[PDB]
Amino acid sequence: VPCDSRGQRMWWAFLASSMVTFFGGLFIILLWRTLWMTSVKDWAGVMISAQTLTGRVLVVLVFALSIGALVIYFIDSSNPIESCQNFYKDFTLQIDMAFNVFFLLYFGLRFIAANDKLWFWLEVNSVVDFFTVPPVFVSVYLNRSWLGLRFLRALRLIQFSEILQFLNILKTSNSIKLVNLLSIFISTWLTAAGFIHLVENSGDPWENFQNNQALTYWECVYLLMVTMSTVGYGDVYAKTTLGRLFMVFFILGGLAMFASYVPEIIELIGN
C-alpha cells in the first residue's frame, strides 16, 4: 500500500493559483479606479515604518524567515520536482507553512499602508508574495508538492544591506553601496540559477516532459557563473528549448545590466 509515484503533472494548477490572484486582482483594482480609513492607514504606515522599533524588528524577522525559506528550498531541491507527501507526517512543510502565512500577514499589513494600491501591486515584493504564498496552500490542500517558483524569495536579499544599516554595522556610503551591489548580484545569480534548474529538470511541456536533464541546483549555479564570465566550457548546458531561450534572455539581460552598472563600479574604484 505505501508507494510514491509522479502520476499526472499538476504544475498548471499551482501556476494558475498565482495567475488568477495577480491578474484578477489587478483587474479588480483597475475597475475600482474606473468606478476611519485614514486613521487605520496611518496606523499601518507607522506600524511598518523603519523609524520605529516595531518596523525594524519586523523587517529583521521577515529577512530571517526569507533566509530560512531559501534554506528550505535548497534542501528540497535534491528531490523529485513533483511528489506526494503527508502534511501531518512531515514538519518541514509545517515550518514552510508558518513562514508563508507570516509572509501573507506582512503583505496584508503592507497593502493597508499603501497610498497607491496599483503601484504597490507591481512591486517585486508583492509579486514574489503572489508567486510564493498561494502555492503552499494549494500543496497542503491537494496533499502533493511541486518545486515551483520558491527560489524567488532570494530576491529579498537585496534588502540585506538595509538590514545592516540600522544595526550600526555600516556607516559610510561607499561600504553601503558595495554591499548593495554584491547583494543584488548574488540575488539575481541565485534566481537565474533557480529558473534554469526548474526549466531544465522539468522538461519541455509540449513533448511530454521527455527532455528532462538531471541537473542539480549547484550545477546550474556553476553554469550561470561560467556563462556570465563569458567562458562557456560547454561541459554543462541547457538542452531544452525553453531552457535555451531563458539562457539567451539571461545573457542579454546580464550584459545590459553590467553595461548599466559599469559607472557605479568605476565610482567604487575611485581615484
Partner: protein, 172 residues
C-alpha cells in the same frame, strides 16, 4: 520484410519461435489479419512499432514470451475485439500503461509470470483487472512483483483498493 507473407491471405496459424527475431518492420503483416494464432516467442524483440498488429483483426491468442520487451506501447497493440488470450511471461516488462486493457473487450487469459513487475500506482489498473478477473491460485502464487527498497515478498494479487487510494484521480 514488409509484406513478408504476401499471397497467404487465408492463413490461419503462424508460429515463429526459437528463431531469434530482433527486428520486425512496421506493416509487415499486410493482409495477414485473418490469422488466429500468432507465436513470436523465444526471440530477442525489444521494441514494437505502432500499428504493427493493426492489420490483424481475427487474431485470438497472442504469445510474446521469452523476449526482451521493456515498454509495451498501447498504440502497437491497438484494438483487437476478437482477441481472447495474451501472454507476456518471461519478459522485462516493468509497468503497463493505463487503459491498454480497456481497449479490447476480451482478455480472459493473461500470463505475466517472471516479469520484473515493480508494484506501484501504475500497476493499479492491472490490480483492478485482477479483482475483476481472478487468476488461478498457482499462477497467483508464481506471479509476484518487486517492492522498491525492501524485499519483493509482496504478491501481485495481494493488493487491494487501499493501495489504489494513494493514486490521485483526475480532479473534478
Amino acid at each position: 520484410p514488409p509484406g513478408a507473407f504476401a499471397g497467404a491471405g487465408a492463413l490461419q496459424r503462424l508460429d515463429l519461435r526459437e528463431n531469434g527475431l530482433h527486428s520486425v518492420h512496421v506493416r509487415a503483416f499486410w493482409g495477414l489479419g485473418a490469422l488466429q494464432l500468432l507465436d513470436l516467442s523465444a526471440n530477442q524483440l525489444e521494441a514494437l512499432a505502432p500499428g504493427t498488429f493493426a492489420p490483424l483483426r481475427a487474431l485470438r491468442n497472442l504469445s510474446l514470451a521469452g523476449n526482451r520487451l521493456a515498454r509495451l506501447e498501447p498504440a502497437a497493440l491497438g484494438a483487437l475485439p476478437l482477441l481472447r488470450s495474451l501472454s507476456l511471461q518471461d519478459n522485462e516488462l516493468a509497468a503497463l500503461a493505463p487503459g491498454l486493457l480497456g481497449r479490447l473487450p476480451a482478455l480472459d487469459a493473461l500470463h505475466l509470470r517472471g516479469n520484473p513487475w515493480g508494484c506501484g500506482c501504475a500497476l493499479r489498473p492491472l490490480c483492478a483487472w485482477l479483482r475483476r478477473h481472478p487468476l488461478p491460485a498457482s499462477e497467483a502464487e508464481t506471479v509476484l512483483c518487486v517492492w522498491p527498497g525492501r524485499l519483493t515478498l509482496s504478491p501481485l494479487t495481494a493488493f487491494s483498493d487501499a493501495a489504489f487510494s494513494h493514486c490521485a484521480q483526475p480532479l473534478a
